[PDB]
């Protein structure tokens, strides 16, 4: 089981756009330059693996997705991981895949709050996990 958190209007808690990208890059040791590049969902699937060991078959996802049809399959795995841990946030997959700033920024804003709630401070090397 996992704990949930909502996000409607909070002050002094939302982070800047520049800082959000630094946190994603620092946690997984990669070179995302734009936040809108997070349309792939490869980083999103890795986040669930870090939060809860197992619960996601990381072999199913692929990090070399470049097409519209390829983007969706990555999110379908994340859909099953959300159900298994019992979270109840509906991913608007029809809107993230277009790779626009609006929808991609709101989802990571919610995911940052979810990350802090279910983090026990464990650390590992994603490089060996990715390969």
């Amino acid at each position: 089981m996992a704990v949930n958190v909502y996000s409607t209007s909070v002050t002094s808690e939302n982070l800047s756009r520049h800082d959000m990208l630094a946190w994603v890059n620092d946690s997984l040791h990669l070179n995302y330059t734009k936040i809108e590049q997070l349309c792939s969902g490869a980083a999103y699937c890795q986040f669930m693996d870090m939060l809860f060991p197992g619960c996601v078959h990381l072999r199913k996802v692929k990090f070399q997705a470049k097409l519209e049809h390829e983007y969706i399959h990555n999110f379908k795995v994340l859909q099953a991981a959300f159900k298994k841990m019992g979270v109840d946030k509906i991913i608007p997959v029809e809107k993230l895949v277009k790779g626009k700033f609006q929808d991609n920024f709101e989802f990571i804003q919610w995911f940052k709050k979810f990350f802090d709630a279910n983090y026990d401070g464990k650390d590992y090397n994603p490089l060996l996990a990715r390969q």
Binding site: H57, K60, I72, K76, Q79, A80, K83, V93
Partner: protein, 435 residues
């Protein structure tokens, strides 16, 4: 030019067939007396046309108890059916599979086969058989197994679709239902190309909720099932922008030899009052037909993973919005497919809007959808039936009746082991595996 024949076995089969043939006569514009006042031929596929203007259906009503067949004979559709086709016995099977398959059913099987053979030789482009039968009923189950064996022996490879009635998890009318259902599943698991599965409790709930009727007698359930059957056959009966056939259904829906138990759903099922305040768009009718509570078998597909889906739209349907809605549905969160079926939708479109029977509960609609889903959630129903059978058989109840009517306990043991093997195969195929 293409002909498929229908065999209705038992009281449930006969009543469902009565409703279905009323619907067909309404659809093709045939008067009850057989005369008449896309369409031209159409009725040639079902109604054989005799010397005069009269049309006679290609139906074979068979039963052992004569009450319901006499009721049909004296019913309003008396001049339509060929009197030789209606085959009746003298005493019923009395919910005894042994009696309906071994003792009694062997005394009329030859006549039934003779009538089937005459009807088949009458036609020239025979396509398949449609068998309307229940599962709990003794005569239904026994004669269905006997007919499957005989037809498979006679005609080698033809489509043989069935429209069964699965016993409800809680609602029950008989007591030997587990024995009958287990036996029939073990016997006819091998001789069936594709069996569509329908439960009475789910149809009760659908009629109560969506259509909002508090007095849903068996007529309404029969009408709904008849609508589903007509939607399946409309591709053969009528032209369309993208046609499908019985072989297409069979090929696209059965991935493995044992896993051929899909479940059906129809949409939209709304009353007359609620019709005006609804817009009835292709996307929303797809969503409603794919909604979990609209499924006509008492099982939630959310508990399992889909394996194959067949959508059939009929009416004023545009393939662009059809394909847009299907893409949205695939993107949705509730639908989760198996890893080895990257493509999981077969789509058919028909140009004939559905017709409405007079006095019926449903309202006129310009768009209709029939959904046939082969999934994994049926494993829970198989397991529940197996548990009921095991609980009853642990101390040999009614086995004295079954053995006295020419059977042995070895048959029960073999049926049990076959059902266990089928459940194990279903679960193993549905579950994911590495590499």
């Amino acid at each position: 030019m293409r002909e498929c024949i229908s065999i209705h076995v038992g009281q449930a089969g006969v009543q469902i067939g009565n409703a279905c043939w009323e619907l067909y006569c309404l659809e093709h514009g045939i008067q009850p007396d057989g005369q008449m006042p896309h369409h031209h031929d159409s009725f040639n596929t079902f109604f054989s046309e005799t010397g005069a203007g009269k049309h006679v259906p290609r139906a074979v009503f068979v039963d052992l108890e004569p009450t319901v067949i006499d009721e049909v004979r004296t019913g309003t559709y008396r001049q339509l059916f060929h009197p030789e086709q209606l085959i009746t016995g003298k005493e019923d099977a009395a919910n005894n599979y042994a009696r309906g398959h071994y003792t009694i059913g062997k005394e009329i099987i030859d006549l039934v086969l003779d009538r089937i053979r005459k009807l088949a030789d009458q036609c020239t482009g025979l396509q398949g058989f449609l068998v309307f039968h229940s599962f709990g009923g003794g005569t239904g189950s026994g004669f269905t197994s006997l007919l499957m064996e005989r037809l498979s022996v006679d005609y080698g490879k033809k489509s043989k679709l069935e429209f069964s009635i699965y016993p409800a998890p809680q609602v029950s009318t008989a007591v030997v239902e587990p024995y009958n259902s287990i036996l029939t599943t073990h016997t006819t698991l091998e001789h069936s190309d594709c069996a569509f599965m329908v439960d009475n409790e789910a149809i009760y709930d659908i009629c109560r909720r969506n259509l909002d009727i508090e007095r849903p007698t068996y007529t309404n359930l029969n009408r709904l099932i008849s609508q589903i059957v007509s939607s399946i056959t409309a591709s053969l009966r009528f032209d369309g922008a993208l046609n499908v056939d019985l072989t297409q259904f069979q090929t696209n829906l059965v991935p493995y030899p044992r896993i051929h138990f899909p479940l059906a759903t129809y949409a939209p099922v709304i009353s007359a009052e609620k019709a005006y305040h609804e817009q009835l768009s292709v996307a929303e009718i797809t969503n409603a037909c794919f909604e979990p509570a609209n499924q006509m078998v008492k099982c939630d597909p959310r508990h399992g993973k889909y394996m194959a889906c067949c959508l059939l739209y009929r009416g004023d349907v545009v393939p662009k919005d059809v394909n847009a809605a299907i893409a949205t549905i695939k993107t949705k969160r509730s639908i989760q497919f198996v890893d080895w079926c990257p493509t999981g939708f077969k789509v058919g479109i028909n140009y004939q809007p559905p017709t409405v029977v007079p006095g019926g509960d449903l309202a006129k609609v310009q768009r209709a959808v029939c959904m046939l889903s082969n999934t994994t959630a049926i494993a829970e129903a198989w397991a529940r039936l197996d548990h009921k059978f095991d609980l009853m058989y642990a101390k040999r109840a009614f086995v004295h009746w079954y053995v006295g009517e020419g059977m042995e306990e070895g048959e029960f043991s073999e049926a049990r082991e076959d059902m266990a093997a089928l459940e194990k195969d279903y679960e193993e195929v549905g579950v994911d595996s590495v590499e």
